[PDB]
Amino acid sequence: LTEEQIAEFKEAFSLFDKDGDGTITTKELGTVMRSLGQNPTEAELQDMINEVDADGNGTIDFPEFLTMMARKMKDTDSEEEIREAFRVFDKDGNGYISAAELRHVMTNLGEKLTDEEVDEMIREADIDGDGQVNYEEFVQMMTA
């Protein structure tokens, strides 16, 4: 249902294209951000456009917005999947996965590990050496 898909993307684009000329400029991007409680500098506004402007003409057109929007979507889907799985491991939602927590989910996965085996797993991902795995350390282990 691309047709319906493009429609939703067109809708998003129009929010930024304040004057409707078919392009988004630094100033238009600027008014959108400011309405969000963010007052970026012209320098920051230029870096944002630079990242998305494939033909280097200085503005973003629909096709350029579409391709970036897409790639961004895919990525937002990744993050929320990993964040979901983090919540399942962090049985007490304290923000960190302990040895005991990791060992209990592992048994549920069909792997009966000893405390020493779980401790080794934690150690491998434990960057701040606090004996637990935080989200940052979890994504590192996940992705990498």
The residue ranges that bind Ca ion (CB under 5 A) are: 17, 19, 21, 23, 53, 55, 57, 90, 92, 94, 126, 128, 130, 132
If the CB atoms of residues 21 and 124 are measured against Ca ion, the closer one turns out to be: 21
CA distance 65 to 62: 5
The SS3 call for residue 24 is: strand
If the CB atoms of residues 8 and 124 are measured against Ca ion, the closer one turns out to be: 124
Angle between helices 2-16 and 26-34 (to 10 degrees): 90
Residue nearest to Ca ion (CB): 53
If the CB atoms of residues 19 and 42 are measured against Ca ion, the closer one turns out to be: 19
Q: How far is the CB of 11 from Ca ion (least distance, A)?
A: 15
CA distance 138 to 121: 11
Any binding-site annotation on 77? no
If the CB atoms of residues 76 and 120 are measured against Ca ion, the closer one turns out to be: 120
Any binding-site annotation on 126? yes
Non-local CB neighbours of 143 within 8 Å, separated by 6+ positions: 82
For residue 132, give Cα distances in angstroms to 3, 11, 84, 120.
47, 44, 18, 11
Q: How far is the CB of 13 from Ca ion (least distance, A)?
A: 10
Q: How far is the CB of 16 from Ca ion (least distance, A)?
A: 8
Q: How far is the CB of 25 from Ca ion (least distance, A)?
A: 6
